[PDB]
Design an enzyme around this catalytic site. Structure first.
Site, PDB file in Angstrom:
ATOM      1  N   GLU A  54      44.784  41.480  26.088  1.00 39.25           N
ATOM      2  CA  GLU A  54      45.721  42.201  26.966  1.00 39.25           C
ATOM      3  C   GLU A  54      47.178  42.078  26.500  1.00 39.25           C
ATOM      4  OE1 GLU A  54      47.555  38.541  28.628  1.00 39.25           O
ATOM      5  OE2 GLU A  54      48.180  40.621  28.936  1.00 39.25           O
ATOM      6  N   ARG A  65      56.758  39.706  35.443  1.00 43.30           N
ATOM      7  CA  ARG A  65      55.959  40.438  34.473  1.00 43.30           C
ATOM      8  C   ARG A  65      55.336  41.733  35.036  1.00 43.30           C
ATOM      9  NH1 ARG A  65      50.839  38.268  32.021  1.00 43.30           N
ATOM     10  NH2 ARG A  65      50.679  39.374  30.006  1.00 43.30           N
ATOM     11  N   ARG A  69      49.191  46.982  32.199  1.00 41.85           N
ATOM     12  CA  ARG A  69      48.628  46.387  30.984  1.00 41.85           C
ATOM     13  C   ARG A  69      48.026  47.432  30.032  1.00 41.85           C
ATOM     14  NH1 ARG A  69      50.887  42.886  33.467  1.00 41.85           N
ATOM     15  NH2 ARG A  69      50.159  40.783  33.996  1.00 41.85           N
ATOM     16  N   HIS A  84      46.707  45.334  37.190  1.00 42.57           N
ATOM     17  CA  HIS A  84      46.141  44.031  36.814  1.00 42.57           C
ATOM     18  C   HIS A  84      44.615  44.059  36.688  1.00 42.57           C
ATOM     19  CE1 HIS A  84      46.462  39.726  35.975  1.00 42.57           C
ATOM     20  NE2 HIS A  84      45.529  39.494  36.881  1.00 42.57           N
TER      21      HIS A  84
END
EC number: 3.1.4.8
Length: 95
Positions: A54, A65, A69, A84
């Site tokens: 990832e 963050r 992704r 996520h």
């Protein structure tokens, strides 16, 4: 489990930025960029251990963050997840 396709050009600019850093091998923005993704829910095709990694897709204006992704596979498969790893689309590089 059929996944949806998404054209590389339709992704957020930041997602495309990530794809470009992966092609270049960083340097990456985060220490956790590059770590193994284990696919424990079998949302991506199931493979052997360490097949998937990832990388963070920058979210402008968090403090953290965030959730977005890219996950890569061992032959160069690319997948988008904004949430996520709750959902994945296979990234189509030709559009």
């Amino acid at each position: 489990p059929a996944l949806a396709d998404v054209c590389r050009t339709k992704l957020p600019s930041q997602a495309q930025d990530t794809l470009a850093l992966i092609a270049k091998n960083g340097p990456y923005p985060y220490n956790r960029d590059g770590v193994v993704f284990e696919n424990r829910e079998s949302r991506l095709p199931k493979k052997g251990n360490g097949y998937y990694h990832e990388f963070t897709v920058v979210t402008p204006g968090s403090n953290d963050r965030g959730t977005r992704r890219v996950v890569t596979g061992g032959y160069g498969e690319q997948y988008w997840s904004p949430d996520h790893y709750a959902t994945f689309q296979e990234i189509d590089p030709r559009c």
